[PDB]
């Protein structure tokens, strides 16, 4: 019983711990001992969600969160029916309104580093990046932020406090060097 398990769990929304349990446990890792993987998931998890809140209430087709199987399914039907290409790894969500899918990226280095390894691992850059960082900054492919600054703002306020909480509870030295 870690106090990080605890803390996420009293942080987060059930639904989204939920959900980050059952993605670990699809890829073979266990919440209760990597618990720095289940708040940074879970963390991801509501960011993608902010993020698909954020615009219209029909611009983004979520991709994170279900299983790979369907999330593999529903990006198929999105190339199939916009002749995208289908990318090669897994995205987070498809903008209708920008017609890419976009890979979202919350990390606790500097948005350079992380950026820069997604960017490499998505070769033929099809797919939208945005990175958000614990710090209040952010990143995205071509200065291209989708959303406006509002719902971004809201974004780099929750993640911010998400690790102040942290700090206050002596779990985020620990949660940093750990990326
Ligand atoms: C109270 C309010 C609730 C949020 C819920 C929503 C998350 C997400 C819900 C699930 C649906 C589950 N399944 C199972 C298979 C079919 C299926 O659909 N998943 C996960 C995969 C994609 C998806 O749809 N949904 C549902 C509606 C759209 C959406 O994104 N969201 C979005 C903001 C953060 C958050 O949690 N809702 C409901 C609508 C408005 C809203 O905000 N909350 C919780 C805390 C913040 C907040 O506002
Ligand atoms: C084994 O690896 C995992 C893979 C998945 C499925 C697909 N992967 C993603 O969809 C995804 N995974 C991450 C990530 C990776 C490692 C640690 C922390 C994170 C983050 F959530 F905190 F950011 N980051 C993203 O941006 C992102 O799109 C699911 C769970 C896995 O542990
Ligand atoms: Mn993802
Ligand atoms: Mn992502």
């Excluded at 879970?42 to 991709?63: A, N, W």
């Excluded at 033929?124 to 200065?143: P, Q, Y």
Aim: glycine fraction near 4%; hydrophobic fraction near 35%; aromatic fraction near 12%.
């Amino acid at each position: 019983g870690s106090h990080m398990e605890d803390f996420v769990r009293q942080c987060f929304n059930p639904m989204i711990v939920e959900l980050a349990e059952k993605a670990m446990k699809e890829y073979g890792e266990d919440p209760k001992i990597e618990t720095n993987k289940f708040a940074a998931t879970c963390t991801h998890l509501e960011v993608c969600f902010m993020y698909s809140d954020g615009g219209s209430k029909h611009r983004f087709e979520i991709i994170e969160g279900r299983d790979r199987i369907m999330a593999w399914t529903v990006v198929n039907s999105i190339c199939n029916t916009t002749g995208v290409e289908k990318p090669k790894f897994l995205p987070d969500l498809y903008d209708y309104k920008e017609n890419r899918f976009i890979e979202i990226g919350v990390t606790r280095r500097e948005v350079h580093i992380y950026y820069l390894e997604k960017a490499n691992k998505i070769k033929s850059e099809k797919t939208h990046i945005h990175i958000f960082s614990f710090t209040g900054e952010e990143m995205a492919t071509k200065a291209d932020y989708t959303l406006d600054e509002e719902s971004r703002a809201r974004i780099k306020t929750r993640l911010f406090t998400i690790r102040q909480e942290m700090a206050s509870r002596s779990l985020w030295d620990s949660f940093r060097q750990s990326e």
